[PDB]
RNA sequence: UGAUGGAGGUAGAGCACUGUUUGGACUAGGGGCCCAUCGGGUUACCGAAUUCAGAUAAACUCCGAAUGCCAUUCAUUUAU
RNA sequence: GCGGUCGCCUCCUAAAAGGUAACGGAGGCGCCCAAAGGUUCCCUCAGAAUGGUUGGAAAUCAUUCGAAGAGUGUAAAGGCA
RNA sequence: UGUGGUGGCGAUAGCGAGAAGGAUACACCUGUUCCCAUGCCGAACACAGAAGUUAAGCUUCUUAGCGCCGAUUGUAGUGAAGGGUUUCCCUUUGUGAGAGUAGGACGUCGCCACGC
């Protein structure tokens, strides 16, 4: 039961969301990064798998930027328990991601090893992804 | 000076071995030693003889 | 502790009013200059014994 | 086997007379709990922070500068 | 030490009073002078006033000035047909040269 | 007394011309002498408030306050409203009399003179003192004194800087280092 | 330097999605002279001035009257597309 | 249905607060030894004293809305 | 059936009037105060920095900054400088 | 015309940074016997007086650092109408969000008294 990330809690049970659109602020702290062209939850353990499959192909690392973090709690009942009584115990920590804003960032590594790391990262997330630069600003150094 | 709740103070003239700090008030009062016109015309009993004259922040 | 209590006209003897007291703070029979209807006159009032 | 399912009852607040009415004497205008609207002209405050119309007139709402709002009644 | 200035608290007391054809009075201090006005709202009009020491008051630096002022206010006001006034306390108490205004205002026409 | 005349004869115009002011209104003065008595032992004994108040009545012709708590913390065994300390303010001519009782009488009864620590200005020019004993005065009997109690003086001025306060209170005594 | 000026109209309701599929840039300009004139562009009009003469240099929005100088400020660029929206100008002098 | 006036926090970008939060600078100063039996505690964690950017809500938000609702000696059509 | 619940008050579900379910999601009640009521005057808080014997980071002081970061008998909302 | 008192208008009135002033007025300032007051203290509070000073307050002038007020299109939503996937997405019509700036902005209107 390897748990990468948690919270400080303040409420056990929570509601269940509605994904309809999600937005805010593309790549800042890096050079190369993903997107997420669909809508899903993303659990704890998928970010374990992403960290490992990123940093193994990063010899001596570089700079990897984790950007979206679990906040919300699962609940679930047992197997064989009827419908009826109150919400089952909270077991898990998930957060939602929708519509092409960015899960990870890379810097400190040339172009082909970066696309290695992102291609070998995105087979462990249930979302269709892309690969994004810093494009053009008033200044991108 | 709210009434009836305050102790004594009168110009108790001071003396010493020397230098005569004949100016101030006091608390412990009593027998007439120098009721003097150039000072307060009161009872000078505080004449205890530590000088405030000789310790070497003075001379 | 506390008591539902009644107050008495000390002149014409009618159980006029009703109030409360905490019987470990006020261990005695109260006295309040309350109005009285039968005399139309402000009257001392005491606890019924 | 839960510890919930208990509640209060809906005590039915809100504005009970619009602007521009012709309002008789002593009828309720906006039942509060906690002062959200202060009274202006001819309006009294009851025990539970309600509002009245002391004069048979016309309710029109206003503001107190920036923060909070007023009600006043103007006769004919 | 910031010695706090003294019109500010007087105006605080003014405004906590004033939140609480029958016009006002006004009562003032300085180191040396005491003024008065008779104002309506929301006309914003003084109908009469009186100086402290300017026209014909002084002849002794006591509160005796203030009794003369409180005479002059009601004397000028009664010619204008006003007997319905309301005292401002200002921002003050009633001990010094303020009851000297008030009792002079009561016994010269202004009804209370 | 002494020092009003000693201000306007020696202390004042020197400090006018040492800093070259436009008027004597910009001169620095001294307003209060704040006097604590931190007992801190009414938690132990309520009879501790006997001695300090009597000694302050011996020092100044007053009776001080009795400060309350404003906290209820068991780390010192305190509830709110518990009696802790006292306060004495001097104004008028008991300013200058007590200052001269400091300078010219009492303070040489501190053995082993290492002066007054000159880093005591509250930043912006007001002195502080923490005094360790109380037998410094001729107003004090021996057998009345039974502890190692002391005083706390905060001399409060009107000055902005620090060396103005230095030159003032050096001109008014204050055996520094 | 001399971009192609197409001065628009006042109310674009749901007509606007026709211009997003045609690759069109409706261009705000609020600045010194103009308070608001939204202006058509083709999306391949700007990139060959940004990557040719400079990413923030002088661009002239003139219809041969007075000479205007702009300072292209911001844009939202929506996800999964990488194409151009929300093009504000800023007309600052010499 | 048209016109006018108003009551009120739903759709969230939003470092106004309440909790949850990821990087950078910085130090107020401390990590078993300080390096030492007066000068650099040091490589490093550095928050609050600070601050540069980024996340986020159902019981977090100065402020909206789509006429939904209540009102008008108002207007047009209809018949309740 | 065994367990849990049965009256009242706050908050969210509640779809920007009012109103509304579930063995939905969180907390309280079955009192207290002779002043903690009425009136008339007067007053402005929490923290932080600098100094000050015992004094401990943090007993009581003094100065500066401080729109509220406090208090409001009792739970939570709405209010109150 | 300058000063003082006294009001309406959402801080566009404010906070900060700076210069000048004393004719009247205001303020600082000198005390406390008198009415009064300090849970100690003429510090305030109440009253006596006018030697002195524009240092502070106050009052006029300058400033866009902080705060405030902000328009148009530019876009999540969304009234209606519709279409395929239906967890959701899209096209006509009817209205739009603050965010982000262009800009405004170091006040306006009223009454009395004194002084020139
Ligand atoms: Zn009777």
């Amino acid at each position: 039961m390897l748990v990468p990330k948690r919270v400080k809690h303040r409420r056990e049970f929570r509601g269940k969301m509605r994904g309809e659109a999600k937005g805010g602020k593309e790549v800042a702290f890096g050079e190369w990064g993903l997107q997420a062209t669909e809508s899903h939850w993303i659990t704890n353990r998928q970010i374990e798998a992403a960290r490992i499959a990123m940093t193994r192909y990063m010899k001596r690392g570089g700079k990897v930027w984790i950007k979206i973090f679990p906040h919300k709690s699962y609940t679930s009942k047992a197997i064989g328990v009827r419908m009826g009584k109150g919400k089952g115990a909270p077991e898990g920590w998930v957060s939602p991601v929708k519509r092409g804003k960015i899960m990870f960032e890379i810097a400190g590594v040339p172009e082909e090893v970066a696309r290695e790391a992102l291609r070998l990262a995105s087979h462990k997330l249930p979302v269709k992804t892309k690969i994004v630069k810093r494009e053009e600003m008033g200044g991108e150094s | 000076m709210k009434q009836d709740i305050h102790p004594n103070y009168q110009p108790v003239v001071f003396m010493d071995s020397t230098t005569g700090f004949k100016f101030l008030s006091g608390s412990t009062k009593g027998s007439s030693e120098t009721v003097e016109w150039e000072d307060g015309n009161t009872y000078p009993l505080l004449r205890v003889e530590v000088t405030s004259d000789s310790h070497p922040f003075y001379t | 502790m506390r008591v539902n209590i009644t107050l008495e006209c000390t002149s014409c003897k009618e159980r006029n009013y009703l109030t409360n007291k905490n019987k470990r703070n006020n261990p005695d029979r109260l006295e309040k200059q309350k109005y009285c209807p039968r005399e139309r006159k402000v009257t001392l009032h005491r606890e019924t014994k | 086997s839960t510890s919930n399912g208990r509640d209060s009852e809906s005590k039915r607040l809100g504005a009970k007379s619009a602007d521009g009415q012709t309002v008789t004497g002593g009828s309720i205008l906006y039942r509060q709990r906690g002062t959200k609207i202060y009274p202006g002209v001819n309006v009294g405050i009851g025990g539970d922070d309600t509002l009245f119309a002391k004069v048979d007139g016309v309710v029109r709402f206003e503001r107190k500068g920036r923060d909070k709002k007023q009600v006043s009644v103007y006769p004919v | 030490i910031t010695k706090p200035d003294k019109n500010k608290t007087r105006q605080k007391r003014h405004r906590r009073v004033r939140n609480k054809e029958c016009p006002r009075l006004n009562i003032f201090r300085s180191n040396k002078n005491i003024y008065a006005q008779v104002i309506d709202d929301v006309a914003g009009v003084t109908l009469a006033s009186a100086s402290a020491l300017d026209k014909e008051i002084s002849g002794g630096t006591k509160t005796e000035t203030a009794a003369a002022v409180g005479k002059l206010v009601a004397e000028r006001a009664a010619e204008k047909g006003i007997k319905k006034v309301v005292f401002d306390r200002g921002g003050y108490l009633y001990h010094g040269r303020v009851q000297a205004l008030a009792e002079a205002a009561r016994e010269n026409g202004l009804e209370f | 007394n002494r020092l009003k005349e000693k201000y306007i004869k020696e202390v004042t115009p020197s400090l006018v011309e040492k800093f070259n002011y436009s008027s004597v209104m910009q001169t620095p003065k001294v307003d209060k002498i704040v006097i604590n008595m931190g007992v801190g032992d009414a938690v132990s004994n309520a009879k501790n408030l006997d001695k300090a108040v009597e000694e302050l009545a011996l020092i100044t012709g007053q009776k001080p306050l009795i400060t309350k708590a404003k906290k209820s913390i068991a780390g010192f065994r305190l509830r709110e409203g518990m009696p802790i300390g006292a306060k004495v303010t001097l104004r008028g001519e008991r300013m200058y009399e007590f200052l001269d009782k400091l300078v010219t009488v009492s303070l040489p009864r501190v053995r082993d003179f290492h002066g007054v620590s000159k880093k005591a200005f509250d930043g912006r020019g007001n002195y502080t003192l923490g005094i360790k004993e109380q037998l410094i005065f001729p107003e004090v009997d021996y057998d009345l004194v039974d502890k190692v109690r002391g005083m706390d003086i905060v001399i409060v001025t009107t000055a902005n800087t620090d060396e103005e306060s230095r030159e003032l209170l050096a001109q008014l005594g204050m055996p520094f280092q | 330097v001399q971009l192609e000026v197409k001065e628009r109209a006042i109310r674009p309701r749901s007509l606007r999605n026709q211009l997003r599929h045609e690759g069109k840039v409706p261009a705000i300009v609020y600045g010194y002279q103009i308070e608001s004139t939204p202006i058509y562009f083709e999306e391949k009009d700007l990139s060959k001035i940004l990557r040719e003469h400079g990413a923030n240099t002088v661009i002239k929005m003139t219809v041969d009257g007075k000479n205007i100088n702009t300072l292209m400020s911001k844009a939202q660029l929506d996800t999964f597309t990488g194409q151009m929206l929300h093009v504000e100008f800023l007309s600052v002098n010499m």
Side-chain angles (χ1 to χ4, degrees), chain A, chain B, chain C, chain D residues 1-32 34-76, chain E residues 1-19 21-44 46-112, chain F residues 1-78 80-177, chain G:
Chain A
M1 295 299 292
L2 298 180
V3 182
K5 292 176 185 177
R6 285 179 182 175
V7 205
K8 291 180 182 179
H9 303 283
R10 88 191 165 273
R11 277 177 186 89
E12 290 181 353
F13 306 101
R14 290 186 180 183
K16 296 181 174 71
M17 289 53 246
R18 288 296 182 95
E20 287 181 355
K22 288 184 73 68
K25 287 179 276 185
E26 293 175 350
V27 167
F29 302 102
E31 302 168 354
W32 298 96
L34 290 168
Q35 283 189 358
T37 68
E38 287 188 354
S39 61
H40 270 281
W41 297 89
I42 288 172
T43 55
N44 288 320
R45 300 179 182 178
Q46 300 178 357
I47 301 169
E48 289 178 354
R51 284 176 187 171
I52 292 173
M54 285 285 284
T55 57
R56 283 181 178 177
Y57 298 133
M58 299 286 283
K59 292 180 181 180
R60 286 179 179 174
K63 290 175 186 177
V64 179
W65 304 100
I66 310 170
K67 292 183 75 66
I68 284 176
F69 306 128
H71 293 285
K72 295 177 178 292
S73 66
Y74 265 156
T75 55
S76 63
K77 286 187 176 183
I79 300 166
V81 176
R82 289 177 179 171
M83 292 296 294
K85 306 175 184 180
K87 287 176 71 71
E91 293 171 353
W93 289 99
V94 208
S95 65
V97 175
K98 182 173 176 65
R99 186 255 198 95
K101 280 177 181 290
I102 298 167
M103 290 301 294
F104 292 97
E105 291 177 354
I106 309 174
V109 152
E111 294 185 354
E112 293 183 353
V113 182
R115 287 182 178 177
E116 285 192 359
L118 295 174
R119 200 272 314 278
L120 293 159
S122 68
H123 288 286
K124 294 180 180 184
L125 302 177
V127 191
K128 287 184 180 179
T129 65
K130 287 185 180 180
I131 290 168
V132 174
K133 291 187 178 180
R134 285 194 179 99
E135 289 183 352
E136 280 177 352
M137 286 299 294
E140 290 182 352
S141 68
Chain B
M1 294 296 171
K2 195 199 295 180
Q3 199 55 254
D4 297 330
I5 55 167
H6 292 89
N8 280 320
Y9 69 102
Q10 283 177 357
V12 176
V13 177
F14 294 160
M15 291 300 291
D16 202 85
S17 67
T18 52
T19 66
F21 297 96
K22 295 184 286 184
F23 297 95
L24 294 175
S25 66
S27 70
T28 63
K29 299 172 187 175
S31 67
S32 178
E33 301 171 349
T34 50
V35 172
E36 290 178 352
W37 185 261
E38 77 275 17
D39 297 330
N41 279 312
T42 50
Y43 302 111
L45 291 193
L46 290 181
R47 294 185 176 182
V48 183
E49 297 175 352
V50 170
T51 64
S52 69
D53 294 324
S54 297
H55 300 88
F57 285 158
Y58 289 99
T59 297
Chain C
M1 291 298 175
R2 294 180 72 97
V3 173
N4 289 323
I5 208 167
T6 59
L7 291 176
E8 183 76 26
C9 179
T10 194
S11 67
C12 73
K13 303 297 186 292
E14 282 188 350
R15 280 84 178 273
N16 286 323
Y17 286 169
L18 187 146
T19 181
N20 291 319
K21 71 181 187 183
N22 192 357
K23 70 175 185 178
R24 58 99 175 175
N25 292 320
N26 297 322
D28 296 328
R29 299 176 67 187
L30 289 178
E31 287 182 353
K32 300 295 180 182
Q33 288 289 320
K34 301 298 284 178
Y35 181 83
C36 185
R38 188 170 180 175
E39 298 179 356
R40 288 190 297 276
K41 184 65 68 178
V42 176
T43 306
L44 191 272
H45 282 87
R46 295 180 71 249
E47 175 180 358
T48 60
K49 188 68 177 68
Chain D
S1 65
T2 63
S3 65
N4 293 321
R6 65 185 76 89
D7 271 329
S8 67
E9 294 179 353
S10 66
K11 291 181 179 179
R12 295 175 176 88
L13 306 176
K16 293 190 171 187
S17 63
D19 290 339
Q21 292 195 4
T22 61
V23 173
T24 61
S27 63
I28 307 169
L29 300 184
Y30 184 84
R31 177 167 291 179
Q32 302 173 357
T35 60
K36 285 183 181 178
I37 298 172
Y38 293 106
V41 179
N42 296 322
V43 174
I45 294 173
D48 292 332
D49 288 330
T50 73
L51 305 177
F52 316 115
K54 297 178 182 177
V55 176
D56 297 334
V58 173
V59 175
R60 284 176 179 174
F61 288 13
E62 290 178 352
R63 71 193 182 189
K64 292 172 75 68
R66 288 187 178 178
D67 286 331
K68 293 178 80 172
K69 303 170 187 176
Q70 278 177 355
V71 187
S72 64
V73 180
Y74 298 108
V76 176
Chain E
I1 295 173
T2 60
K3 296 178 183 179
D5 293 332
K6 297 178 183 179
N7 272 319
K8 303 174 184 179
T9 63
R10 287 173 181 172
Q11 289 176 358
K12 287 182 183 178
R13 296 169 184 169
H14 269 287
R15 294 170 191 172
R16 289 187 184 182
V17 167
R18 286 162 179 164
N19 276 321
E21 293 179 356
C22 298
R24 283 182 182 178
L25 285 184
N26 274 320
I27 293 169
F28 301 106
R29 293 179 185 172
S30 73
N31 291 323
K32 292 176 184 178
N33 285 312
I34 298 159
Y35 297 159
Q37 289 178 357
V38 176
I39 311 172
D40 274 329
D41 301 325
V42 197
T46 60
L47 287 173
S49 72
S51 72
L53 300 174
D54 300 336
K55 284 91 168 65
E56 53 266 9
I57 292 95
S58 68
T61 63
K62 288 185 179 180
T63 67
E64 300 174 353
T65 62
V69 173
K71 287 183 180 179
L72 290 173
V73 172
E75 286 174 353
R76 293 184 183 178
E79 292 178 352
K80 299 180 182 180
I82 292 170
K83 291 183 181 179
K84 296 174 184 177
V85 202
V86 173
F87 291 109
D88 276 333
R89 201 183 74 199
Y92 310 104
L93 293 175
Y94 286 1
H95 281 281
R97 47 244 182 87
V98 47
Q99 282 186 351
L101 282 173
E103 295 181 354
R106 289 187 181 178
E107 291 179 352
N108 283 315
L110 305 177
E111 294 179 353
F112 298 98
Chain F
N1 283 315
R2 293 186 183 181
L3 302 176
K4 287 184 179 180
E5 296 175 350
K6 293 181 180 181
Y7 270 0
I8 311 170
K9 287 180 181 181
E10 290 175 351
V11 178
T12 54
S14 67
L15 296 173
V16 174
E17 293 179 353
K18 280 179 180 180
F19 297 99
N20 299 315
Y21 296 103
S22 67
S23 68
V24 190
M25 299 303 292
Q26 271 179 342
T27 51
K29 293 181 181 181
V30 175
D31 284 331
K32 299 177 187 178
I33 296 168
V34 177
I35 295 167
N36 290 316
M37 277 307 296
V39 175
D41 294 330
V43 175
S44 68
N45 291 320
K47 298 181 180 181
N48 296 318
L49 297 172
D50 297 331
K51 297 177 183 178
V53 174
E54 291 176 355
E55 287 185 353
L56 292 183
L58 293 173
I59 293 169
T60 67
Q62 296 178 0
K63 284 189 284 291
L65 291 179
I66 296 172
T67 64
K68 294 175 180 175
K70 293 181 181 178
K71 291 179 181 181
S72 67
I73 293 170
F76 304 102
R77 289 187 176 181
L78 293 174
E80 288 183 352
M82 290 299 292
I84 294 169
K87 291 180 183 179
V88 167
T89 67
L90 295 175
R91 306 297 186 95
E93 293 183 355
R94 290 189 183 178
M95 291 294 292
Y96 305 112
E97 282 181 352
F98 182 76
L99 284 170
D100 296 328
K101 284 183 180 178
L102 291 166
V103 173
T104 63
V105 175
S106 64
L107 287 170
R109 295 182 185 271
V110 173
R111 299 177 182 178
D112 288 331
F113 291 97
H114 302 290
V116 177
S117 66
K118 296 182 182 181
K119 297 177 184 178
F121 294 158
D122 290 329
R124 296 172 182 174
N126 286 312
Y127 290 9
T128 56
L129 284 176
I131 299 171
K132 295 178 182 179
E133 288 188 358
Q134 284 162 348
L135 288 172
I136 309 168
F137 293 92
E139 297 176 351
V140 169
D141 292 330
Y142 294 102
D143 293 329
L144 299 179
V145 173
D146 292 327
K147 288 186 183 178
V148 199
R149 289 182 185 175
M151 307 295 291
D152 279 321
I153 299 171
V154 178
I155 303 166
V156 183
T157 64
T158 64
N160 294 320
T161 71
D162 290 331
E163 291 185 353
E164 288 176 352
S165 63
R166 290 180 184 175
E167 293 179 354
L168 278 169
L169 299 176
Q171 283 177 358
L172 299 176
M174 294 302 293
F176 292 115
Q177 298 173 353
Chain G
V1 177
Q2 294 177 354
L3 287 174
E4 296 180 354
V5 175
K6 295 180 183 179
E7 296 176 352
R8 296 179 71 196
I10 301 170
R11 183 190 285 272
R13 60 172 180 266
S14 298
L15 308 171
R16 289 176 174 176
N17 280 320
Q18 189 71 42
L19 300 171
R20 184 173 290 117
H21 284 284
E22 290 182 357
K24 299 293 289 185
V25 174
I28 307 170
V29 47
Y30 65 93
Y32 171 69
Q33 289 178 357
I34 296 171
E35 296 182 354
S36 62
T37 57
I39 293 165
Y40 290 99
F41 287 102
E42 294 174 352
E43 189 168 356
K44 290 185 180 181
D45 294 334
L46 294 176
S47 65
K48 295 178 175 65
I49 292 175
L50 296 177
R51 291 184 291 174
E52 178 174 357
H53 292 285
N56 291 315
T57 58
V58 176
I59 296 170
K60 296 180 182 178
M61 289 297 298
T62 71
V63 199
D64 288 332
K66 291 184 180 181
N67 294 320
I68 306 169
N69 299 315
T70 60
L71 283 176
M72 312 288 289
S73 70
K74 287 177 184 177
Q76 70 184 352
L77 301 176
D78 199 354
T79 71
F80 177 70
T81 64
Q83 60 178 353
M84 298 297 288
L85 299 172
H86 198 281
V87 177
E88 300 185 354
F89 293 179
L90 184 65
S91 68
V92 183
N93 286 316
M94 296 293 288

